[PDB]
């Protein structure tokens, strides 16, 4: 069509740019002593994220620091290498940008844009739940981001509020590609977060990008309800609920929202929205999105429903507090062969 043929052309250009960067990734674009450390923003099994200041410019960044020995111990080499490769190759308004990367004797470093508004998770637990217009604004961003990622044959596999950052203008930034995979056909890994796993992952089937559309259904439900559709004390009980095709909706959900959710939280793959012959357009054209101006969202011209409080550059009030630990760099090169391509 008109709008239709524009989308086709846009995604073909996007795939060409992605593939060029995928095939020749950038390496070694800064070094540690170019930055001052300010504060730990989060910690993980094999690294931490810190707010840093670039000494030359004064610009702030979020620096992910991965301990190479821990990455090896935890069998995360391929996931780490893959995350950096994806991040340096993608380009979309709602994906966090990689600004620099480098490595040293002990660590790998990914220097990303700092997103001062913090995780959606905190805002959702604080506020309780989002009204449907508010939830719809964020959902539209994810729909567009998945359309983009899926056109590159990337499955995301870890959608949840914990992984969605809110920027200064109120828009989403997706940050963590540690489980993303380039998959034209099917894949089989059991991975993700219990509450957000699609049934076909739990049932140990081969699965495809349709798991991201299931997870969108879970996200929209949690945003609009304040709690996820399937929960329990233990993950095993969560899985039993997920693979039942049973869901209950709060009485305040609109009829349109319930109908959309029935079609995303669809255990039957042949029936799940996003996985049918019209693909993502079954979602974009759904009655719940009738008021959504998809191009205006993409162009970030829609007034956001919530703007986080920002007291300047380097303000960290929207992140938790963590014990500050030294960044030791060993005199001995650790795990050099394993991380050659980083």
């Amino acid at each position: 069509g008109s709008e239709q043929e524009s989308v086709k052309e846009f995604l073909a250009k996007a795939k060409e740019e992605f593939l060029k960067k995928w095939e020749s990734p950038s390496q070694n674009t800064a070094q540690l002593d170019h930055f001052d450390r300010i504060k730990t923003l989060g910690t993980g099994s094999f690294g931490r994220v810190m707010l840093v200041k670039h000494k030359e410019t004064g610009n702030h960044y979020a620096m992910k620091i991965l301990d190479k020995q821990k990455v090896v111990k935890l069998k995360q080499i391929e996931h780490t290498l893959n995350e950096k490769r994806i991040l340096q190759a993608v380009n979309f308004p709602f994906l966090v940008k990689l600004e620099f990367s480098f490595k040293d004797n002990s660590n790998l470093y990914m220097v990303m844009e700092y997103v001062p508004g913090g995780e959606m998770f905190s805002h959702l637990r604080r506020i309780g739940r989002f009204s449907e217009p508010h939830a719809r604004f964020y959902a539209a961003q994810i729909v567009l981001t998945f359309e983009y990622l899926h056109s590159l044959d990337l499955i995301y596999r870890d959608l949840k509020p914990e992984n969605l950052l809110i920027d200064q203008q109120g828009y989403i930034q997706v940050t963590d590609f540690g489980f993303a995979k380039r998959v034209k056909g099917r894949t089989w890994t059991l991975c993700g977060t219990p509450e957000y796993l699609a049934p076909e992952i739990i049932l140990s089937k081969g699965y495809n990008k349709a798991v991201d559309w299931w997870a969108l259904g879970v996200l929209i439900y949690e945003m609009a309800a304040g709690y996820p559709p399937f929960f329990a004390d233990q993950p095993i009980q969560i899985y039993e609920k997920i693979v039942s095709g049973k869901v209950r909706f709060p009485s305040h959900f609109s009829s349109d929202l319930k109908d959309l959710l029935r079609n995303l939280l669809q255990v039957d793959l042949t029936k799940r929205f996003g996985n049918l012959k019209n693909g993502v357009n079954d979602i974009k054209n759904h009655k719940w999105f009738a008021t959504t101006d998809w191009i205006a969202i993409y162009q970030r011209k829609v007034e956001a429903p919530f703007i986080p409080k920002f007291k300047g550059p380097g303000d960290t009030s929207n992140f938790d507090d963590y014990e500050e630990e030294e960044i030791r760099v060993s005199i001995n090169e650790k795990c050099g062969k394993e991380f050659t391509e980083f």
Binding site: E162, G178, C191, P194, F231, D233, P235, R248
Partner: peptide
């Protein structure tokens, strides 16, 4: 209520991957 059941689940904090 469903909300009370969610609080009783103990899974109201940040959730790790599997």
């Amino acid at each position: 209520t469903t909300y009370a059941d969610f609080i009783a689940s103990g899974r109201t904090g940040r959730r790790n991957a599997i």
